[PDB]
């Protein structure tokens, strides 16, 4: 599923990301735009052979099992395919663990390089929330 910008902001709010660990909703939406273009089926291979999955491009090196990432972990206890669902509950729940792991949203290099310190509230401007 390819979400619209306000559609995604609403589903993230419902599943509790708004101000989770202090990150306003526009931070989450900006991260989703640059990680996946709001597409839940996005996948991208990393140079180390891990893969990133779904709307927030969660990596199989640490967070989900894809069966083909040697020496990796599964800290969210899910198959990475779960992270491609039109239902974003699994990605959100796993994201809450990631952003609690100590580096906040810097875990998302696209967030650090394209969202951090910008006017992220523009990403939810006008959204009936
Ligand atoms: Cl933080
Ligand atoms: Na893994």
From Swiss-Prot:
Root EC class: hydrolase
The record's section on CDD domains has:
LYZ_C
Which keywords does this Swiss-Prot/TrEMBL entry list? Allergen, Antimicrobial, Bacteriolytic enzyme, Disulfide bond, Glycosidase, Hydrolase, Secreted, Signal
Q: Which PROSITE patterns match?
A: GLYCOSYL_HYDROL_F22_1 (PS00128), GLYCOSYL_HYDROL_F22_2 (PS51348)
One annotated GO molecular function is: identical protein binding
Q: Which residues bind substrate?
A: 101
Disulfide-bonded cysteines? 6-127, 30-115, 64-80, 76-94
- Catalytic residues (positions): 35, 52
Q: Which residues form the C-type lysozyme domain?
A: 1-129
| GO BP annotations, alphabetical order | cell wall macromolecule catabolic process; defense response to bacterium; defense response to Gram-negative bacterium; defense response to Gram-positive bacterium; killing of cells of another organism
Q: What is its main location?
A: secreted
Compartments, record wording: Secreted
The EC code for this enzyme is 3.2.1.17
Q: From the record, what ranges are coiled-coil?
A: none
Q: In which tissues is it expressed?
A: In the egg white and polymorphonuclear leukocytes.
The record's note on quaternary structure and interaction partners says: Monomer.
Q: What else is known?
A: Lysozyme C is capable of both hydrolysis and transglycosylation; it also shows a slight esterase activity. It acts rapidly on both peptide-substituted and unsubstituted peptidoglycan, and slowly on chitin oligosaccharides.
Q: What does this protein do?
A: Lysozymes have primarily a bacteriolytic function; those in tissues and body fluids are associated with the monocyte-macrophage system and enhance the activity of immunoagents. Has bacteriolytic activity against M.luteus.
Give the protein family: Belongs to the glycosyl hydrolase 22 family.
PANTHER family xrefs: LYSOZYME C
**Name recorded for this polypeptide:** Lysozyme C
UniProt organism field: Gallus gallus
